[PDB]
Design a protein around this nucleic acid. Structure first.
Lengths: 291, 485, 472
RNA sequence: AAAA
RNA sequence: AAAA
């Protein structure tokens, strides 16, 4: 404790109940990662003005790199690289960081970069950790806590538009498609399943009113609740031995989605790489195989 | 040391400065040290003596009475944290600012010659101060550093000038010698206050290919447009406040760009690729409000793709009736930048564009994305280029609904791009496109916005049209998905 | 020191005066007070006054000024104007008073030209740098008083005597001014009209066409004058004229040489000369075909009043307005369908669809070029795809000609929507202003080779190319 | 679908 | 489609 400016900030550090640990996943130049962390620092200071990155490295020793799931350049489009990234960095990150601040609980702030990676991180994050999942808003360059973390009928669906097709009720292969961003994956994901995985049973999750615009000024928990209800609905009626997940969803939404279905479902996760040759989808990891 | 002070009165200054820095002096000569505070041509010695007297609380009552400063403020000056301003000298010296709470305005300046109360400094700075220095400076050009330290809510920036009771700032002599970031081209109190205490720094960025004189004219127009909303902004002020020259903000090349994909990709890599990253690095603690205008429409889709949807940008289109820019794309502030990527518009809900999708070769996963929002029709030429060269019969044609060639520069152009993106992603609904080919005759700002919205996530090859070229005049200058590589 | 000041008081040496001025600027008031009365050098007199601004009471009582306003001159940043003697300077210092007192410190005596303060709408103190005789410095002080934008005006000098009623008497230099309404608008406007004339022939005809065009510009900008324009920016009549003696040869290299020598850089140079202020171009041309090239070099990025030529009565009628409330973009409106055509009729004949060559024939003038252009394209270019644009029911000069250009561009782009045309060959008989507007709108983008026709001459000849205008 |  |  050397870089302390105000006594008020010092008082809260030694006499607080929860310590916020902002975790960010980024792939690229380390200079832009520094910019991303600074924007993340402001959002934590709205709720904890005493919080600071420099102070975070004094009392405990948590470093900006230690809070960052960081990799130089574009992540290679190899399944082993993704599984290595999750195993070498993500899997032990949250367990170790909690042990650093042992006496006091942790309120996790999270914001990622690669949407597909969040399902692996969210599943490995666990549902026993209180998390404030953030989602950057770009008109002001600010973070908004959209998640402050089932059994919802289809008729009572608020923002999502679920849809289930069973064209060949023989196999137990399901293509789970989630469309919440603005780049439609349904055309590519449906063609990928038919041409490569031989799948014609699909569960489509789509925004009901505003495709690509979910207001980042409210709670996105009802968005996640509808997805879990629709997903669980198909499992009771039809037994799926393996579900294949394709999603164009916000980064925060995917991280919360992984928490809800972490390791308890046989889900295959497929990533879309923009700078890759056809096929652009690849099973980077399977949600039930990270344990 | 009394002997050293007497020798200075009749090397010596360094000895006493080091002696007083460790507080090795005694109170017996402190009154004599007080005489030093009134008999020293170097302001540093006087400021150090004043601080020592405030700390020791010896003979400070007489100084407080003579200077019209409350004893409480003088005592607080001992433990106050002095803010530092930087101003050039005949090197770059520092100005020391101490907080004060005197009822009367006392912006006392401890000068080498004599102590003078520049009370109008306190009025402009909204705080009473105790100005200190480190060396003897001829001419009171130190005003701007003190004013900047006063108007903050900082060693990166240095200031030079003289203020007036009206609040105006006038520069001093030896400007060229002093200039050998140094802020000296500022005149108004509001300008400095806003430049110091803003939250977003405007960054007017323009893309031009031609001569330097027209580039200067374009940058002057962009500066006027930015000053319309930020009256404190100035290209000179940006240059001396952050080091961002007009060259840094310009995607500039000499003459006509060669009609080779290698030339376009080299231009993107050398200038466009890292320009925004470095400029955002320069203004680190503050956010950036990118004001953007361009020249070549096709180069924009790449410029926007590298720009990304993660930056708040006012994209401006020039209106040539008055030769004035209009903020046709507002993607900052209350106006949500998420509406940039609003693909919820159905075809029946289109009000600005007219879009059609022809699928004559369903077995082939390629289509021609042709956009016609300008006036020179590219539909025939681009369709012929696809059918004769790229062998493509699938097309997504987007034109204007009612007024082709005239898009109201006063209105907001966001719905045009929203409907375009919605049509694109509705084409991507039931179809898988291995490659998309983009041929557009569209406004510069609209092209930049489309590049921002679509980004690098789609297999899009953009084909520029060159007027002074032999057939074929279309050529894939770049691909949207290969810009990150 | 004091002895040096006393010696300078009793001597006319300039070195001592300069030393005293430097000492006063870098900081014995009796000698300073004495030097104020003994105004041997106005530069020394002004410097001494500012030193007293920070016997203030005596000066205020004697000079008829206040005290707070007098001491406010030290804290005021002066405005600098330039007037010829070399180029001496007038310094204006802010003053606040009820009665108008434009105190001017001169070598002879301090005088209050009260009319100057009223005309300039601000009380001021006038200082100088040299012993200048006469009252030729009125115009510089008045101009620096009437300025609104805060910028140094050292690029412009003025000379003249301003009489109290609001007129200037004659003694870059500005001395052709006659009214204060001219001077106020020549410094406080943002759109400076630039009248550009393209004429080929005798110099006298160019001269009186330029005079009539100046009159037409003054019809809207009554403060404009060619002499005033030359005074303020050095833009002479030759700097605004696309001239050349005699009949232009039919050789294509002659027209390209004319375009590259004068037309190519004229607009950019003139807009560089009028650097901060916007430009409202006024354009009139003579040869119809050349305008398509000139317009291509002019471009759509310029607000222009395009005026037609009238040989009967030498008066200009503006037929194209591309300035104002977003009126520019309207020239590029191509939304007019064939059904709702109110001015022109278009016939797009295609006989060889596999050939991407089009003959763009336009007949909106006097002589009908359809037969000649058709024969030329079918005999010297082997073209059977034609686009003939003519009138429906020759053109009213009073009415705006924007719909003509709008529908021409609409027809051209409708033709380009359904076919690919490698080359377009422009053969037109149209009014000069309409040709210029077509060159502005179509621009250097579409590959168009414009052929000019001369009845006195191989009647047709490829004169230039739209796409190559950025090269030649 | 690489902060949507 | 080279500030449409």
């Amino acid at each position: 404790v050397h870089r302390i400016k105000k006594i008020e900030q010092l008082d809260a550090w030694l006499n607080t109940e929860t310590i916020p640990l902002p975790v960010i996943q980024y792939q690229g130049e380390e200079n832009e990662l520094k910019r991303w962390q600074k924007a993340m620092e402001q959002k934590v200071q709205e709720k904890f003005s005493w919080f600071s990155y420099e102070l975070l490295e004094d009392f405990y020793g948590i470093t900006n790199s230690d809070l960052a799931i960081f990799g130089n350049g574009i992540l290679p489009f190899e399944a082993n690289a993704w599984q290595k990234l999750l195993q070498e960095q993500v899997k032990d990150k949250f367990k170790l960081l909690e042990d650093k601040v042992m006496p006091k609980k942790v309120l996790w702030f999270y914001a990622g970069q690669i949407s597909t990676l969040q399902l692996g991180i969210g599943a490995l994050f666990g549902f026993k950790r209180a998390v404030s999942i953030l989602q950057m808003e770009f008109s002001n360059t600010t973070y908004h806590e959209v998640f402050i973390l089932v059994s919802v009928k289809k008729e009572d669906y608020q923002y999502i538009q679920s849809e289930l097709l069973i064209n060949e009720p023989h196999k137990n292969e399901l293509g789970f498609i989630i469309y919440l961003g603005s780049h439609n994956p349904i055309g590519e994901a449906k063609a990928y399943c038919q041409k490569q995985l031989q799948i014609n049973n699909f569960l489509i999750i789509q925004a009901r009113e505003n495709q690509g615009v979910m207001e980042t000024s409210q709670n996105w928990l009802p968005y996640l609740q509808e997805i879990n209800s629709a997903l669980n609905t198909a499992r009771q009626e039809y037994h799926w031995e393996r579900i294949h997940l394709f999603q164009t969803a916000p980064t925060a939404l995917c991280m919360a989605l992984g928490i809800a279905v972490g390791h308890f479902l046989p889900v295959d996760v497929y990533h879309y790489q923009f700078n890759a040759e056809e096929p652009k989808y690849r099973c980077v990891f399977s949600l039930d195989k990270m344990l | 040391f009394n002997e050293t002070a007497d020798k200075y009165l009749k090397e010596a200054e360094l000895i006493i400065l080091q002696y007083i820095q460790q507080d090795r002096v005694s109170e017996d000569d402190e009154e004599w040290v007080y005489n030093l505070l009134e008999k020293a041509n170097n302001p540093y010695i006087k400021l150090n003596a004043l601080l020592w007297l405030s700390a020791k609380r010896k003979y400070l009552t007489q100084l407080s009475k003579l200077w019209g400063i409350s004893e409480n403020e003088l005592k607080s000056l001992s433990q106050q944290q002095p803010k530092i301003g930087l101003f050039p000298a005949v090197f770059l010296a520092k100005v020391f600012v101490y907080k004060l709470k005197s009822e009367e305005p006392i912006a006392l300046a401890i000068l080498g010659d004599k102590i003078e109360n520049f009370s109008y400094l306190a009025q402009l700075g909204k705080q009473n101060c105790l100005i200190g220095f480190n060396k003897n400076i001829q001419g009171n050009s130190w005003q701007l550093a003190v004013l900047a330290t006063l108007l903050v809510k900082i060693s990166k920036i240095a200031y030079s000038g003289i203020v007036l009771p009206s609040g105006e700032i006038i520069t001093a002599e030896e400007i060229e010698y002093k200039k050998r970031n140094l802020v000296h081209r500022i005149k108004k109190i509001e300008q400095l206050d806003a430049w110091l205490n803003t939250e977003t720094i405007p960054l007017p960025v323009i893309q031009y290919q031609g001569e330097e004189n027209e580039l200067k004219r374009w940058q002057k127009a962009m500066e006027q447009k930015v000053q319309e909303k930020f009256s404190w902004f100035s290209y000179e002020l940006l240059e001396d406040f952050y080091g961002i020259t007009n060259s840094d903000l310009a995607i500039f090349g000499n003459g006509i760009l060669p009609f080779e994909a290698n030339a376009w990709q080299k231009l993107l890599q050398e200038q466009v690729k890292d320009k925004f990253k470095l400029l955002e690095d320069k203004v680190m603690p503050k956010k950036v409000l990118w004001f953007y205008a361009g020249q070549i429409s096709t180069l924009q889709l790449g410029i926007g793709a590298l720009f990304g949807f993660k930056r708040a940008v006012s994209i401006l289109q020039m209106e040539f009736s008055n030769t004035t820019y209009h903020e046709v794309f507002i993607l900052y502030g209350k106006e949500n930048a998420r509406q940039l990527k609003n693909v919820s518009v159905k075809k029946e809900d289109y009000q600005y564009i007219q879009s059609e999708l022809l699928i004559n070769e369903p077995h082939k996963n390629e289509l021609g994305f042709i956009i016609y929002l300008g006036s020179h029709n590219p539909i025939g030429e681009a369709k012929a280029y696809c059918q004769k060269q790229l062998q493509i019969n699938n097309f997504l044609i987007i034109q204007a609904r009612e007024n082709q060639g005239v898009m109201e520069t006063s209105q907001n152009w966001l719905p045009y791009l929203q409907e375009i993106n919605s049509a694109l992603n509705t084409a991507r609904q039931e179809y898988h496109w291995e490659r998309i080919h983009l041929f557009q005759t569209a406004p510069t700002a609209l092209c930049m916005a489309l590049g921002i919205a679509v980004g690098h996530f789609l297999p899009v090859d953009v084909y520029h049209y060159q007027f002074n070229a032999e057939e074929p005049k279309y050529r894939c200058v770049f691909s949207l998905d290969k810009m990150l590589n």
